Design a protein around this ligand. Structure first.
Ligand SMILES: O=CCCNCC(=O)O
Length: 240
């Protein structure tokens, strides 16, 4: 997250760190949202590579022991059948990860509230992106969980010429684009928490940013719209 502030330890308990094995250690690659005690919602591109993945819930600092973390392996990866690795712009950048063990719930580990099916936010709706992604374009990962206010940019404005054009689909949510705040590499798969009727709900799964940079004016961070996949999410959980 570029232009973010350090989130409070118990502000976003559904945020998880998706990590891969690298030698004798583990490295953060993406974010995710805990949706069931044994299920994590992330981006499909995050699991494109044939790496060994683990999920860390109750995580705040990646480099230090917070004394609140629970480490669990990934038992099954269910990517959306329509996902194409050669086309992130086509959408369907969503995947569900079944955890090997069911995580224990507390103030640092809670389930993410999902929006009702078909919910589209009005333009400039209040949202917050969270993650351990790069703090600057071509920078490094954040040590502590970062948050940034990213108001929504509706389909009409985001799919216009000066913005994203035909790249953005209606199955996506766009947020930010102020040139200071945005998602960045490593935030992918993570949540976009939006305030609807007093409650924060995970309306987006971080998908992509501009190739020219993360915090680029008129190039808001693009997320997979969670409300377009409620039936899919429920069908996967019910069959597995
Ligand atoms: O697009 C999201 C940030 C980059 N994700 C790369 C990855 O970890 O797969």
């Amino acid at each position: 997250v570029v232009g973010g502030t350090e989130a409070q330890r118990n502000s976003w308990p559904s945020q998880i760190s998706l990590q891969y094995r690298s030698g004798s250690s583990w490295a953060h690659t993406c974010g995710g949202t805990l949706i069931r005690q044994n299920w994590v919602m992330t981006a499909a591109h995050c699991v494109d590579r044939e790496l060994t993945f683990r999920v860390v819930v109750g995580e705040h600092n990646l480099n230090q022991n917070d004394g609140t973390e629970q480490y669990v392996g990934v038992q099954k990866i269910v990517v959306h059948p329509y996902w194409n690795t050669d086309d992130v712009a086509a959408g369907y950048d969503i995947a569900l990860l079944r955890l090997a063990q069911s995580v224990t719930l507390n103030s640092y580990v809670q389930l993410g509230v999902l929006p009702r099916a078909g919910t589209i936010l009005a333009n400039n709706s209040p949202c917050y992106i969270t993650g351990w992604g790069l703090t600057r374009t071509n920078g490094q990962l954040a040590q502590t969980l970062q948050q940034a206010y990213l108001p929504t940019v509706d389909y009409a404005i985001c799919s216009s010429s000066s913005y994203w054009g035909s790249t953005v689909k209606n199955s996506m949510v766009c947020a930010g684009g102020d040139g200071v705040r945005s998602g960045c590499q490593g935030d992918s798969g993570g949540p976009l928490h939006c305030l609807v009727n007093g409650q924060y709900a995970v309306h987006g799964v971080t998908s992509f940013v501009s190739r020219l940079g993360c915090n680029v004016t008129r190039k808001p961070t693009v997320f997979t719209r969670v409300s377009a996949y409620i039936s899919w999410i429920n069908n996967v959980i019910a069959s597995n």
